């Protein structure tokens, strides 16, 4: 018999993104080639099957630095990290292949699905 | 020119609640009278003006244990902690006064507003 606040989840995610932009309580650095991205482990796990697996591992859960596979493009990662914290995906003709490959690697099934749909249309 | 995934924020919050239920990556204990509640600092900050102030403080940001004011009712806190992680508020005739008082203390303005509306109706 609960009541529900429709905008609560969106407002929580907006505040988590504000903490990210101000580098507050970020507990991990994701290294993609030369590029470094600071984030919250919980948000990464909530969005990605790959980070979920990494941070539930008894040894990796304690690492402050995670290095991604050298084939991963920093821009594709940046677009996906922004999507994790905002629900908005900056999908463009020039980045769609790098975004799909990065989403497949990160195990972000809904991003993979829309990339496959957008590629099929073109 | 981004696209948006409507269910993303709700899915993120659902996964953060699953991490909470399994005690994964919880980094703080909130003590309310004798009762203890494990949670994620980022989620608490995203939902509450009081926790936002506490964990942006250079000294308090590093505490693993936070003791609330002894007037705070553990059940009122439990109902609000569940709301933070689910968007669902278990508001009942027998708990509304304790829920409103706890929401005022935690600075959760939308919960305070609905409690004031529900009290006025009765």
């Amino acid at each position: 018999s609960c009541i529900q606040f429709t905008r609560h989840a969106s407002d929580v995610l907006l505040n988590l993104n504000r903490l990210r932009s101000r580098d507050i309580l970020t507990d991990v650095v994701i290294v993609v080639s030369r590029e470094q991205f600071r984030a919250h482990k919980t948000v990464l796990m909530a969005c990605s099957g790959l980070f979920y697996s990494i941070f539930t591992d008894q040894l990796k859960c304690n690492l402050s630095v995670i290095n991604l596979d050298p084939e991963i493009n920093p821009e594709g990662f940046c677009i996906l990290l922004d999507f994790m914290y905002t629900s908005r995906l900056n999908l463009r003709e020039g980045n769609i292949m790098a975004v799909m490959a990065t989403a497949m690697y990160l195990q972000m099934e809904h991003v993979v699905d829309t990339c496959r749909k957008f590629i099929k249309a073109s | 020119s981004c696209i948006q995934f409507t269910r993303h924020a709700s899915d993120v919050l659902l996964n953060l609640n699953r991490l909470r239920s399994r005690d994964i990556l919880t980094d703080v204990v909130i003590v309310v009278s004798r009762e203890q509640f494990r949670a994620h600092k980022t989620v608490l900050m995203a939902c509450s003006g009081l926790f936002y102030s506490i964990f942006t403080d250079q000294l308090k940001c590093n505490l693993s244990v936070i003791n609330l004011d002894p007037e705070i009712n553990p059940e009122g806190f439990c109902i609000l902690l569940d709301f933070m992680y689910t968007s669902r508020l278990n508001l009942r005739e027998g708990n509304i006064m304790a829920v409103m008082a706890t929401a005022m203390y935690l600075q959760m303005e939308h919960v305070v507003d609905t409690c004031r509306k529900f009290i006025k109706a009765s």
Binding site: I3, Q4 | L89, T114
Partner: peptide, 4 residues
């Protein structure tokens, strides 16, 4: 607020 809604009835979910």
């Amino acid at each position: 607020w809604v009835i979910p």
